[PDB]
Design a protein around this ligand. Structure first.
Ligand SMILES: Nc1ncnc2c1ncn2[C@@H]1O[C@H](COP(=O)(O)OP(=O)(O)OP(=O)(O)O)[C@@H](O)[C@H]1O
Ligand SMILES: [Mg+2]
Length: 288
């Protein structure tokens, strides 16, 4: 875990040039950087506008990510920490962007999307039980899944992690377990829920925003998928991502099986949700 200066990160990011921006939110800007010539991502918190959650998310990401390692997790290289000037994480650069960009001939066949689910599941199994204490990520969603030079998925963005010991929901709310969104309850099951929603979006191509139908009742992504799965393989086909090739029985059957797993993950009651271990198990049977 190297500590970097402002000047070092300024130089690496070409003076934080707009053309090096590879990612943005209200709370941070992520820059491509080059330090032995190692390519990195520099996640720079927005200290000027949002000092106190910049601090919370900075320290959370730094404390959490510096203790963890796994092939399906983002990797921290170092940080810069100069109050009032810069707080930044220096991360392994992931050349193929994030899963949100990948979702919204194509490489993203049913098998390749199943592979991403498996990879993310490995990351989440490690978070929940591979370290000395369970780490709950709390923001599982496609924009927090990055892609390798080998298109291997990596769980990223630990700014909301906790260590234990038109639309229907806009922005990121559609990914959140109800007990997490409404009461900030944190358990490993909140990540199981979000993983279910991620998998649904990955195979339908639909953000989990949902829709207010015209009686004013919201149709969640989960309910859309539940209705399709209940209508059999032909129902599932109707709801799958139109940009995804679904030609063989095997590809449709595999996608149907993922959505059935995703529906169990997104159960309303936390106790009805499987653990990530059983989720991984189901997905590993489906990669055979
Ligand atoms: N290591 C990395 N390599 C390449 N791109 C990255 C990396 N980390 C982040 N990005 C890009 O930056 C975007 C946002 O970064 P990140 O999610 O870490 O912080 P955030 O924007 O504050 O979180 P959120 O978007 O959930 O509010 C990602 O969607 C991704 O496209
Ligand atoms: Mg974040």
């Amino acid at each position: 875990l190297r500590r970097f200066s402002y000047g070092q990160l300024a130089a690496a990011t070409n003076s934080f040039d707009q053309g090096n921006v590879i990612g943005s939110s209200n709370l941070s800007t992520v820059y491509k950087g080059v330090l032995g010539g190692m390519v990195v991502a520099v996640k720079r918190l927005n200290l000027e506008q949002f000092p106190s959650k910049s601090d919370k998310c900075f320290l959370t990401e730094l404390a959490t990510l510096s203790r963890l390692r796994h092939k399906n997790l983002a990797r921290v290289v170092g940080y810069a920490w100069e109050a009032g000037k810069i707080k930044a994480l220096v991360l392994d650069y992931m050349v193929n962007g994030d899963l949100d960009g990948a979702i919204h001939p194509s490489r993203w066949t049913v098998r390749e999307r199943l592979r991403v689910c498996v990879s993310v599941a490995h990351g989440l199994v490690y978070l929940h039980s591979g370290y000395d204490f369970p780490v709950v990520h709390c923001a599982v969603k496609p924009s927090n899944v990055l892609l390798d030079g080998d298109w291997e998925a990596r769980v990223s963005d630990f700014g909301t992690a906790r260590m234990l010991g038109s639309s229907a929901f806009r922005g990121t709310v559609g990914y959140m377990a109800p007990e997490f969104a409404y009461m900030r309850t944190v358990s490993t099951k909140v990540d199981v829920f979000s993983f279910g929603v991620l998998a649904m979006e990955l195979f339908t191509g639909r953000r989990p925003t949902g829709t207010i139908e015209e009686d004013g009742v919201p149709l969640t992504l989960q309910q859309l998928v539940d209705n399709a799965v209940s209508r059999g393989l032909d129902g599932v086909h109707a709801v799958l991502d139109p940009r995804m090739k679904v030609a063989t029985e095997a590809d449709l059957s595999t996608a149907a099986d993922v959505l059935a797993v995703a529906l169990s993950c997104a159960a309303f009651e936390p106790a009805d949700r499987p653990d990530m271990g059983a989720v991984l198990s189901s997905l590993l049977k489906m990669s055979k």
